[PDB]
Amino acid sequence: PFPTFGGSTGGWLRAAEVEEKYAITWTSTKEQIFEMPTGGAAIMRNGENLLYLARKEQCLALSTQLRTFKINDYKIYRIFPSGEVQYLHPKDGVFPEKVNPGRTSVNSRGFSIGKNPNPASIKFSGITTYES
Amino acid sequence: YASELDSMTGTGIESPKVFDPLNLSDYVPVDWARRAELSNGRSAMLATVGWFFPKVFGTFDSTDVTTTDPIDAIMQADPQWWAQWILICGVFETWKYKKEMEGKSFLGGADPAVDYLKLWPADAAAQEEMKTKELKNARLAMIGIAGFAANHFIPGSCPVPDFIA
Amino acid sequence: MAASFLPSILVPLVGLIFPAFSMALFFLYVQTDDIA
Amino acid sequence: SVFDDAVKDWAEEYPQFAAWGWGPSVQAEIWNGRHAMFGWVVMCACAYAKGHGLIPDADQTLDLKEWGTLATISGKNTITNERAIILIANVHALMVGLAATISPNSFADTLLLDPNHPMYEWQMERNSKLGGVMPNLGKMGVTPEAELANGRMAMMGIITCIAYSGIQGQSMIDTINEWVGGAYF
Amino acid sequence: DFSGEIGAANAELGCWDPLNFCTDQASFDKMRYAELKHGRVAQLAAWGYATTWSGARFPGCEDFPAGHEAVLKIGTENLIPVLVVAGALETLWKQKEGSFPGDFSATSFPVGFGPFAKTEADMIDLRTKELNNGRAAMMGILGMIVHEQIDGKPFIFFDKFEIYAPF
Amino acid sequence: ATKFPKFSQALAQDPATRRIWYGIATAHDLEAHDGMTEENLYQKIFASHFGHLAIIFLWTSGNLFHVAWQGNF
Amino acid sequence: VDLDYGMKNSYVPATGGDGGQGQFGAQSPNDWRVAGTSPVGETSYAGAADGGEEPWFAEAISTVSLDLQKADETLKAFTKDAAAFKIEEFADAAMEELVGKLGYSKFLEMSTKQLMKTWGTL
Amino acid sequence: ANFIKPYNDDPFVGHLATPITSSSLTRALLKNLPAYRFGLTPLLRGLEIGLAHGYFLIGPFAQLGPLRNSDIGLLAGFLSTIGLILILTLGLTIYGAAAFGQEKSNGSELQTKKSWDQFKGGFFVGACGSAGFAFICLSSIPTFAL
Amino acid sequence: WRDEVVVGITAPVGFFDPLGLSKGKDDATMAYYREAELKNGRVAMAACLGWYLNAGGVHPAFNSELSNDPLKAMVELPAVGWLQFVLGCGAIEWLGQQIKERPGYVPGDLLGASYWVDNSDEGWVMYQNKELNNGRLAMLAIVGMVYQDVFVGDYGDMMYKQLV
Amino acid sequence: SHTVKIYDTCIGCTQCVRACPTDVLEMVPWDGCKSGQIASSPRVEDCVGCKRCETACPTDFLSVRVYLGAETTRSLGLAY
Ligand code: CLA
Ligand code: CLA
Ligand SMILES: CC(=O)O[C@H]1CC(C)(C)C(=C=C/C(C)=C/C=C/C(C)=C/C=C/C=C(C)/C=C/C=C(\C)C(=O)C[C@@]23O[C@]2(C)C[C@@H](O)CC3(C)C)[C@](C)(O)C1
Ligand SMILES: CC(=O)O[C@H]1CC(C)(C)C(=C=C/C(C)=C/C=C/C(C)=C/C=C/C=C(C)/C=C/C=C(\C)C(=O)C[C@@]23O[C@]2(C)C[C@@H](O)CC3(C)C)[C@](C)(O)C1
Ligand code: KC1
Ligand code: KC1
Ligand SMILES: CC1=C(C#C/C(C)=C/C=C/C(C)=C/C=C/C=C(C)/C=C/C=C(C)/C=C/[C@@]23O[C@]2(C)C[C@@H](O)CC3(C)C)C(C)(C)C[C@H](O)C1
Ligand code: SF4
Ligand code: SF4
């Protein structure tokens, strides 16, 4: 289910084999040319498409481009060398820009940015002002 | 001494039991030691012949090396000869390596690495006799080349016939 | 032996041997995965 | 004893080096003793060759246009022929030693205790056996004990020769000659 | 008879016969007999040419020219005995029926693989060496004669061989 | 703290050549090092000051030695 | 398939200036520092591909893939809590009705009242 | 018709099969070089590589070094080559230490500490011996005149 | 082999073996024949180009001291140059034999173009034919030029110089 | 990994989330503002530190703050 692509020198390197790799799948309703983030143009297949990339940012750039094609079913995974997979995006089946019940807020501080403590007040504690 | 020496060729009649007074076989493994004994001994056989061959039978017809002294001939010989001699020895060593990789032997095994006159018999006892003869003449030639060298550097150290000293 | 020989003795040790060994040691230390 | 405490404390202060056998180890004692014995041979040869004038043009200096600035001692004053010759002989020995350090064979006594070398266990066993103040008179001939004892004797002799030459205000060659009853000069 | 015989160029080419001179086994056997005979004669010829041309004469003939001039200057009475000896030999060698061409072990006087060979591989290797040296020597005598009749040095880089014989 | 620099976990885990550079550039910023206390900071500074004074006296001794040995004073 | 496989890395978060390991882990659990290429017949590292007669390009051979079945299964495994939340708020069998009637991705995408509407049909 | 295609029929790997990377000449050469050739011991790989390099390394030193116009120029070139080989051997040694650690190697593959030590020793011997061989060869250059 | 090979068969003469030197030859023998035809043709093409350059006077090596006559420059070249030429070609030949052992090797295809294209493609067959025909012409041309230089004394152009 | 904090001046405009190139941020329910949502950064392991989110934020001062810290492969944006 690979798109029609003649190859490039911009693809993944040894890291994809030994550290981590990324995959993006999506469904197209016709054969259409798109821009590979790694350089050059590829032809989407009618139906399911799968593409491997070195970085998550490359997958998200491609997904941003897919949105201009009216394609919103893309899924982004991370694959480890052992073959374990992580489903990354959209994490809960809903795009992060659309508020969703069941998400919990992470990393909020209940005050305006001007109320962080003074550095001299936490010297030698090992913490930063934004984490305390 | 090592235990494997018991099942090895090298004991004879002049020394029917394993001769290793210094127990040098605790340090040099027997396979390496025997390969090196044969290497040094074969080189010493050739050396013992070449020590006197040009003096007794004449040199070739060249002026490159005018002396018949075995030692003073070294620096007189052209370095192109020495480079090609090193090269041919390297060719020999490569042949030995390749033959041993092919399951052949230059250490008295079954299939000879080098036997161009077709003299290796198919009998284990006859092969044992041949191996004993080669090793005896190898040790004798090592002794002889050492003696020639000693008498040359230090006259009288070894009873070498003065005409081939 | 005389002290007048010391430059030609010491300069190659200070300017070639010492930097090479120091650089090799620092390389080995920075490549070590568990130092403590 | 002070010896065990000393070695242990040195290892605790320099663990990375102590791993390879560097420092006050049995391995270093063995290797430095071997070198001291060979060096007694070389020093005696130098004394004998100086006494009999067997080194050609010993007091003549090397040509600057031939060997260049590397052969200079101060300005354009060049090293003598004798010193260059002694250096070259020791360089022969040093090239042998570098070949042995860099490319040991499998049954060889390596310079450092490398866990991956096939001699590591034998080396550790031998080094554990050697130790003590008096040489083992039970063990003689070509044995590690005798080798260690003679290496110690050679290093002691080097120290005593340097010290005696210093006290007498004479050269080390002069001491070597006067210790063999003036057999060289 | 084909690539499984003695003298094949190699395994891939096999019996190298661009002119299709070998079709059945009978033609190949006749051709191999002729080839082995020519190679033996040419080995002897190259030996003798190199020997005489290098200034070496048998007692009695210390004045005769060395190369092919020895067939124009030496009188018939000295050339004839070679024919007599060769004829005596032609009537003597007898091919063992059932063996390879050039196997003359059926000869009256004893001939064959003596202590030289024990195994079949040894005999095959010895035969291949005889045949290969025969082919090389055929080329060699041809080249010697051509280069003598062209410029006078049958050996193109030197004039005479200066043999080393210690004994 | 398992790799160089042992004073910074954040740097020791960087997988790039940056880890080396920053280690060198942060070695003397003892206040920022992992697990530093005030007392240890003052003690390490005291010892480093002894080292610096040793360097100064070595430099002066060397100037004196080179003039004495090789100069025309 | 373990879900914390990414988190079980060797990255030890620092006490300051470090966001730590987030939802999936700060880094891969696999040590990227492996050997360079190797001669014919040998492997550079544990799971390395055998480059056959061209070991110098051995690293250009892929041993990491994503087959569609693994994709669907890890999609379900990683979003099991979100689906559990959606059924908890819309309200076992009901989830099997919804996720087969319209789909699993659509079930994630819809709303509890909308699913209360599609549950009206049977 | 198309002399370029994705390497390993994988469009998304960062490599292309071109005549330079995938010709029969390139493949035969690379598979036969001692760094890759099947069946060599690590020591023999190191030895062959050292033999190849030390022979040519003497040339620049002999012909262009400071003492090139002295009559000991060849000897100085050989000494310079030996010094370069020592520098390279130090590089190989510390590389192996970094890349493989100091633990006992579990295998005989070249990319292991024990095998890399064998390879480094073979390289040192091959390079120094090859520099010496080139010194001998340069001591007497044949004109090739009959 | 005759019902398998398409490269080398071209217009005017089609398949050209009047002497019947290909009948009853095995596939290995005909592969040898094609490899030899190609190698002789390629060497002859290179020889023709080099001869033309030398004859024209464009031989700037050795301070252009060598004779414009290629057969004289052949002997004025020192021995070591010929030794290098022969040994370098020998090394290339060794590598070529290694290539030849490989499965699916197409006789004369050192580049291994079979990894990308085959004779089912028309243009590739056509370009192979261009190579082969120019090789045949260059073999004839090098023989003819050597004749004209040896027996007729003239080492240059005797066909088109007479026009202009 | 970088640190990304959301302060309570967030008006839930979702612009930082749309700006993020590596999907670090997401909108979560919250009763602190009129829009009924606040930004969140649950996936800081993938934050590269580009600060596009800060460029997108309309409040004064910023409601999303990126503090750069310990570098990883992911935060350095390495394809190798
Ligand atoms: C130890 C071996 C050895 C070495 C290093 C030398 C070295 C030398 N020889 Mg001496 N020589 C030797 C043995 C040796 N020789 C032997 C065995 C003979 C009798 C054939 C001679 C007879 C001889 C004569 C007449 C002359 C020399 C001369 C010289 C000098 C010039 C080189 C030369 O032309 O010699 C030629 C050397 C040979 C022909 C040696 C034979 C070649 C070997 C032994 C063949 C072995 C191959 C074997 C069958 C297969 C290997 C099996 C397996 C390992 C693969 C040079 C110093 C010349 C000189 O200047 O003297 C003053 C000279 O005129 N040599
Ligand atoms: C970068 C340009 C450059 C070049 C070409 C040179 C060249 C030279 N320098 Mg100089 N020099 C330079 C910059 C340069 N220098 C700089 C920046 C400094 C510091 C200020 C110096 C300071 C200096 C000093 C003090 C000396 C020199 C000397 C020399 C000479 C000897 C050097 C030598 O033997 O190296 C050895 C070279 C090598 C070991 C290898 C060379 C590279 C090889 C040939 C590349 C091969 C690649 C191959 C073709 C690829 C494909 C091969 C195949 C497998 C496909 C040589 C003429 C010495 C001299 O006496 O001059 C007359 C000398 O004493 N230089
Ligand atoms: C006074 C007193 O007390 O004594 C005196 C006596 C004496 C003699 C004066 C003195 C001396 C010197 C000594 C002891 C000299 C001993 C010399 C000795 C023992 C010399 C062997 C040479 C072997 C050769 C040349 C082999 C070539 C064989 C070759 C080239 C081969 O190819 C090997 C071969 O196997 C294969 C590979 C393949 C086969 O198909 C073919 C063969 C079979 C050939 C002393 C020291 O002064 C003491
Ligand atoms: C009673 C009993 O048992 O008897 C037994 C004993 C024994 C000994 C065991 C047996 C045997 C074996 C025998 C008879 C072996 C004899 C072999 C022989 C006589 C072999 C010639 C080779 C010449 C060649 C290959 C080519 C040369 C020349 C070539 C290739 C040239 O180009 C010529 C040349 O001039 C030029 C043109 C150009 C120069 O630039 C080069 C040179 C100079 C070279 C037998 C058969 O078993 C019989
Ligand atoms: C059809 C293919 C072709 C080849 C393969 C070829 C080869 C050579 N030509 Mg010829 N030639 C033409 C065609 C070809 N030439 C044409 C169409 C014309 C009319 C313009 C023409 C005229 C001249 C003139 C006046 C001279 C000449 C020469 C050479 C010589 C040196 C080559 C070089 O170095 O450029 C080599 C053998 C010179 C010469 O013979 O010097 C002794 C010389 O003076 N040519
Ligand atoms: C391995 C690297 C390498 C070096 C460093 C090198 C160097 C020189 N080459 Mg060589 N060369 C090859 C490789 C190398 N060459 C190979 C693989 C081949 C076979 C394709 C080859 C062929 C020829 C031919 C035909 C000639 C030739 C020459 C010279 C000469 C010029 C200076 C001079 O000698 O004046 C210098 C020293 C000419 C010559 O030696 O003329 C007497 C000459 O005619 N070469
Ligand atoms: C007891 C112990 C104490 C201790 C101690 C004391 C005094 C220790 C004594 C140490 C001192 C006495 C150790 C000298 C060795 C002699 C050297 C190695 C000789 C090398 C000689 C060799 C390497 C060199 C040879 C050459 O040079 C020669 C000869 C000629 C040249 O041509 C060739 C060569 C290069 C080969 C502590 C540590 C203070 C505290 C602890 O708590 C208790
Ligand atoms: S800094 Fe960049 S990568 Fe990080 S959260 Fe903001 S927009 Fe996303
Ligand atoms: S952090 Fe800023 S950009 Fe993001 S939702 Fe809040 S106000 Fe909007």
J33 annotated binding-site participant: no
Picking from F50, F3, H15, G116, the residue whose alpha carbon sits closest to that of residue A13 is H15
G35, two tokens:
């050997």
Task: Tell the residue nearest (CA) to atom 36 of ligand 3.
Answer: B115
**Which pair of tokens denotes residue I38?**
């190609």
* Partners of E120 in beta bridges: none
Neighbour subunits, D (≥3 Cβ pairs < 8 A): B, C, H
Pair H5, H17: CB distance under 8 Å: yes
Tokens 């995938």 found at: H22
Indicate the top mutation candidate among E49, E155, E160, E163 to test ligand 4's pocket, ranked by most ligand atoms within 8 A of CB. E155
A23: three-class secondary structure by DSSP = strand
Q: Which residue has the tokens 């503090």?
A: J67
Which helix (H) or strand (E) is C19 found in, with range? helix C18-31
Do G32 and G44 contact (CB within 8 A), yes or no? no
G27 touches J at CB < 8 Å: yes
Q: Are F30 and F4 in contact (CB under 8 A)?
A: no
Residues of H in contact with A17 (CB under 8 A): none
Q: Is F31 on the interface with A (CB under 8 A)?
A: yes
Rounded CA-CA distance E134/H29 in Å is 37
Atom 4 (ligand 9) nearest CA: J16
Nearest CA to ligand 2 atom 42: H60
Helix axes I27-55, I122-150, angle to 10 degrees: 60
Cβ within 8 Å, pair I32-E13: yes
CA distance I55 to D138: 90
Distances (CA, A) of B164 to B41, B61, B70, D181, E167: 20, 21, 10, 39, 17
**Distance between the two ends of chain A, CA-based, in angstroms?**
49
What region, left, alpha or beta, does residue E98 occupy, with left being phi > 0 and alpha being psi -120 to 50 degrees? left
Locate the chain A residue with the closest alpha carbon to H17: A7
The ligand placed nearest to the CA atom of residue E50 is 4
Angle made by CA atoms G103, G104, G106, in degrees to the nearest 5? 65
Which residue puts its alpha carbon closest to atom 8 of ligand 9?
A: J13
Specify the amino acid at residue E12.
E
Phi and psi at residue A79, to the nearest 5°: -120, 130
Q: Helix (H, G, I), strand (E, B), or coil: what is residue G42?
A: coil
Distance from CA of A72 to the nearest CA of H (A): 23
Q: Which distant-in-sequence residues (6+ apart) come within 8 Å of B6 by Cβ?
A: B18
Contact check, Cβ <8 Å, I110/H144: no
Q: Which residues of A touch J8 (CB under 8 A)?
A: 108-112
Separation between Cα atoms, residue H31 and residue H19, nearest integer Å: 16
Are C20 and H94 within 8 A, CB to CB?
Answer: no
Q: H1, I112: Cβ pair inside 8 Å?
A: no
DSSP-derived letter for residue J28 is: E
Give yes or no for a contact between A74 and A49, defined as CB atoms under 8 angstroms apart: no
Residue I29 exposed, middle or buried by CB count within 10 Å (0-12, 13-18, 19+): buried
User: How was this one solved?
Assistant: cryo-EM
Q: Report the relative pairing of strands A75-79 and J37-40 from DSSP bridges.
A: unpaired
> Does J13 sit in the ligand 8 pocket, CB within 6 Å?
no
Which element (helix H / strand E) includes A35? strand A33-35
Mutate to test the interface with J, among A55, A87, A131 (most CBs of J within 10 A): A55
- Give nearest CA residue, ligand 1 atom 41: B46
Which token pair is H36?
């890759």
Q: Which of A6, A13, A42 sits opposite H14 (nearest CB)?
A: A13
Chain G residues within 8 A of F15 when measuring between CB atoms: 32
CA distance F32 to A26: 47
Q: What is the CA radius of gyration of chain E?
A: 19
Helix (H, G, I), strand (E, B) or coil at E97: coil
Cα separation, D26 vs E62, whole angstroms: 81
Beta pairing class for J26-29 and J37-40: antiparallel
Q: Among A3, A6, A11, whose Cβ lies nearest the Cβ of H13?
A: A11
The CB density around residue I2, as the number of other CB atoms within 10 Å, is: 11
Closest residue on chain D to H115 (Cα): D116
Residue D129 one-letter amino acid: K
Q: Which chain H residues are within 8 Å of G43, Cβ to Cβ? A: 109
Q: Is D16 helix (H, G, I), strand (E, B) or coil?
A: helix
Q: Is the CB of I112 under 6 A from ligand 6?
A: no
- Distance between CA D26 and CA A132 in Å, rounded? 56
* Cα atoms in the Cβ-side hemisphere of radius 13 Å centred on E72: 5
Reported residue count of chain C is 36
Whole-number Å distance between alpha carbons of D16 and D14 = 6
Omega cis (within 30) before B153: no
B11 DSSP β-pair partners: B9
Residue the block writes with tokens 């010297």: A123
Write phi, then psi, for D77 (nearest 5 degrees).
-80, 125
End-to-end CA distance of chain I: 47
- In this structure, what DSSP letter does residue C17 have? I
Q: Is the peptide bond prior to A90 cis by the omega test (within 30 degrees of 0)? A: yes
H35: its two tokens: 């760094």
- Which residues numbered 31-60 in F keep a CB inside 8 Å of some CB on G? 34
Amino acid making up residue B159 = P
**Residue D152, both tokens:** 């110690």
Query: What DSSP assignment string belongs to D50-99?
Result: HHTT-STTTTPBPPHHHH-GGGEEETTEEPBHHHHHHHHHHHHHHHHHHH
Q: DSSP for G55-90?
A: GGGGGGS------HHHHHHHHHHHTHHHHHHHHHHH
B vs D, Cβ pairs < 8 A, gives: 8
From the CA atom positions of chain A, what is the Rg in Å? Answer: 20
Is position E16 annotated in a ligand binding site? yes
Six-digit token string for B59: 């040199």
The verdict on whether omega for the bond into residue G55 sits within 30 degrees of 0, i.e. cis, is no
| Backbone phi, psi, residue B22, to 5° | -80, -5
The ligand minimizing its distance to the Cα of E116 is 4
Taking CB atoms and an 8 Å limit, are D68 and H70 in contact across chains?
yes
Residue B11 per-residue DSSP state: B
Resolution in Å equals: 2.3
User: Who contacts J47 (Cβ-Cβ below 8 Å, separation ≥6)?
Assistant: G19, J1, J2, J4, J22, J24, J41, J66, J75
End-to-end CA distance of chain C: 45
Q: What order do you get walking across the sheet with A21-28 strand by strand?
A: A47-53, A21-28, A75-79, A85-89
- Distance between CA atoms of residues I34 and I30, nearest Å: 6
Q: Calculate the dihedral angle through the C-alpha atoms of E61, E62, E63, E65, rounding to the nearest 10 degrees.
A: 80
**Number of helices followed by number of strands (H, E) in chain F:** 3, 0
Structure tokens at H39: 């069946």
Q: How far apart are CA H83 and CA H86, in angstroms?
A: 5
How far apart are the CA of G79 and the nearest CA of chain A, in angstroms?
A: 6
Q: Give the closest of J70, J73, J76 to F10, CB-based.
A: J70
Q: Which of E7, E10, E8, E15 is nearest to E36 (CA)?
A: E7
Pick the residue whose CA is nearest to atom 15 on ligand 7: D155
Q: Are the C-beta atoms of G102 and G94 separated by less than 8 Å?
A: no
Q: In the structure, do chain J and chain G come into contact, i.e. share 3 or more CB pairs under 8 Å?
A: yes
How far is E125 from chain I, CA to nearest CA, in Å?
Answer: 25
Q: Which of the listed residues E37, E123, E156 should we mutate to test ligand 4's pocket, taking the one with most ligand atoms within 8 A of CB?
A: E156
Q: Do residues A56 and J43 lie in contact, with contact meaning Cβ atoms separated by under 8 Å?
A: no
| Site of tokens 């090397």 | D62
In degrees, to the nearest 5, what angle opens at C-alpha E96 toward C-alphas E91 and E99?
140
**E90 labeled binding residue:** yes
Task: Please state whether beta strands J3-7 and D77-78 pair in parallel, antiparallel, or not at all (unpaired).
Answer: unpaired
